Amino acid sequence: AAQTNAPWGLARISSTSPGTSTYYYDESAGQGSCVYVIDTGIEASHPEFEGRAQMVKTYYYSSRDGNGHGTHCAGTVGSRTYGVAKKTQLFGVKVLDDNGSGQYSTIIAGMDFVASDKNNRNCPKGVVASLSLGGGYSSSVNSAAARLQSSGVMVAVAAGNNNADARNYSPASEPSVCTVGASDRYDRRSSFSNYGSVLDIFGPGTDILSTWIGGSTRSISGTSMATPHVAGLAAYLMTLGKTTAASACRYIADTANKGDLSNIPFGTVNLLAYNNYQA
């Protein structure tokens, strides 16, 4: 299939060169997979989700996305126009308040919830979790993410927006999950993107159009925006049987676009998420 006039990030992850505008992808579109977006929530009513999004857990007085960040990230996973895997099921877990903030105790609680909750749900192609969040180094938080991965979930977490080594941030610094850095439409490493040896893959992250609260859209920037590209891609490939939850991050990095980003510091991988879809 092909989406003409797609957001540059969708076009990037189906192309061996930047500057293109059509998103080529296998029509399976992540059908039969599930992706937990662990964030400020998801505005499930958004027409862009086509009824494929629901909330399943909140840790605050409401489960509504009063910020937009979570709806923006979910839209990159599986919205019709802004999504990598357009037929995947989205599940919202609100560990972040409407200001974008979340306690670590709460985020750990959310990850443990996902590992268990996946057993209530019909996800015959497998389960992904997208964690566009993080903070300073915490070994409990890294531990929480490794548990979720070990439980059978493909975890992707943002590398961070500190323009620093991600070794000092969490869950970015957990070796067993997929840590996603951000690039721009010109294949530069994004100005804010963290880096370092913990990084596994890069995804589109600067000026990313996606869904927003109030039935709307907007472009924003962050490694929070690169993560759902990789999360959505993992669900896409799993639906296709190309890879499993435990091996998707390695699969994505072995088949990425290699050596094509600029301003990658020494000791950080130069790999850009890529679907290698050949019609």
Side-chain angles (χ1 to χ4, degrees), residues 1-26 28-86 88-257 259-279:
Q3 169 178 12
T4 80
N5 290 91
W8 77 269
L10 295 191
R12 191 81 212 63
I13 75 142
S14 68
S15 177
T16 81
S17 38
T20 89
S21 85
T22 299
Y23 176 38
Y24 299 105
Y25 70 89
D26 188 281
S28 38
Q31 178 61 246
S33 70
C34 306
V35 182
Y36 287 84
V37 177
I38 305 171
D39 210 295
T40 67
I42 309 167
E43 181 177 275
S45 57
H46 197 333
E48 277 282 332
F49 298 122
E50 308 180 281
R52 285 179 290 98
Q54 39 168 309
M55 292 303 291
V56 301
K57 183 79 181 93
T58 180
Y59 290 95
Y60 306 93
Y61 68 123
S62 184
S63 80
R64 302 298 103 240
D65 187 10
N67 178 287
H69 184 250
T71 300
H72 196 277
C73 296
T76 297
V77 180
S79 68
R80 52 179 196 209
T81 313
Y82 316 94
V84 173
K86 304 179 184 294
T88 192
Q89 182 86 7
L90 308 160
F91 296 126
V93 186
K94 173 178 194 48
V95 307
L96 301 188
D97 62 24
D98 294 327
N99 286 322
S101 286
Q103 269 328 302
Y104 272 173
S105 47
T106 309
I107 291 158
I108 299 182
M111 291 188 253
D112 291 339
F113 175 101
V114 167
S116 184
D117 184 77
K118 72 185 196 301
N119 299 124
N120 305 315
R121 321 278 179 197
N122 193 52
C123 301
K125 302 311 208 193
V127 182
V128 187
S130 205
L131 285 76
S132 291
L133 50 65
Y137 179 85
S138 158
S139 78
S140 296
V141 168
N142 283 3
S143 199
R147 284 197 301 279
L148 184 52
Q149 176 80 47
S150 172
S151 84
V153 178
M154 188 297 176
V155 185
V157 316
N161 322 301
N162 320 88
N163 185 24
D165 202 309
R167 58 156 50 240
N168 279 322
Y169 299 94
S170 275
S173 47
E174 167 53 38
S176 63
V177 297
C178 211
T179 310
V180 183
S183 57
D184 70 13
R185 64 169 83 241
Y186 295 106
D187 292 348
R188 298 173 282 219
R189 172 177 63 92
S190 302
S191 154
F192 47 85
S193 179
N194 285 346
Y195 51 80
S197 72
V198 75
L199 267 56
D200 299 301
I201 194 82
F202 277 85
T206 299
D207 304 330
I208 305 289
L209 189 52
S210 191
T211 36
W212 201 251
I213 45 89
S216 70
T217 59
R218 85 175 45 172
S219 277
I220 47 168
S221 302
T223 62
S224 283
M225 279 70 244
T227 304
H229 282 94
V230 167
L233 180 59
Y236 170 74
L237 303 164
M238 290 156 54
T239 288
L240 270 200
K242 289 254 199 303
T243 204
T244 88
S247 319
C249 187
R250 187 184 304 220
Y251 183 90
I252 287 177
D254 277 343
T255 64
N257 277 313
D260 295 322
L261 299 175
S262 67
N263 208 18
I264 309 278
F266 201 57
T268 302
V269 314
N270 195 324
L271 295 158
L272 184 55
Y274 176 42
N275 76 359
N276 198 53
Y277 171 62
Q278 304 279 339

